Design a protein. Structure first.
Ligand SMILES: *[C@@H]1O[C@H](CO)[C@@H](O)[C@H](O)[C@H]1NC(C)=O
Lengths: 50, 50
C-alpha cells in the first residue's frame, strides 16, 4: 500500500457564525452550541465578548 | 403669633429604589422547543439582539 491517510467526519444540523473579510473569503467561524463562550458569541453576534 | 412650645414629629415616607430585574429568551418564548420555528427566527435575530 501507499503512504496516504484520510479522515471521515459526519455533518450534523448546526448553527454557525461566519466572518467574511474584506476580500470576501471566510477567515473565521464560531460554532454556536459548542460551549458557553461560543454560545454567548452566538447570542451577541460577535467574535469578542467584553 | 410666637410659638411657646414644640413637638418632635416623625414622618415616614417610602420611595421605590429598584424593580425586579428580568431577562427574556427569544428562542424558547417565540419558538418554544421546535427546530423548524427556530430556523425561521434566525433572520429576525437582530431584533432580539436589540
Ligand atoms: C486582499 O486583496 C488585495 C488585492 O486585491 C491584497 O492587496 C490584500 O493583501 C488582500 N488582503 C487579505 C487579508 O487577503
Amino acid at each position: 500500500a501507499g503512504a496516504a491517510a484520510y479522515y471521515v467526519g459526519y455533518l450534523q444540523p448546526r448553527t454557525f457564525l461566519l466572518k467574511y473579510n474584506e476580500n470576501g473569503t471566510i477567515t473565521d467561524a464560531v460554532d454556536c452550541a459548542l460551549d458557553p463562550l461560543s454560545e454567548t458569541k452566538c447570542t451577541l453576534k460577535s467574535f469578542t465578548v467584553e | 403669633a410666637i410659638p411657646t412650645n414644640f413637638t418632635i414629629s416623625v414622618t415616614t415616607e417610602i420611595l421605590p429604589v429598584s424593580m425586579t430585574k428580568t431577562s427574556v429568551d427569544c428562542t424558547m418564548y417565540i419558538c418554544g422547543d421546535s427546530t423548524e420555528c427556530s430556523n425561521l427566527l434566525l433572520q429576525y435575530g437582530s431584533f432580539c439582539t436589540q
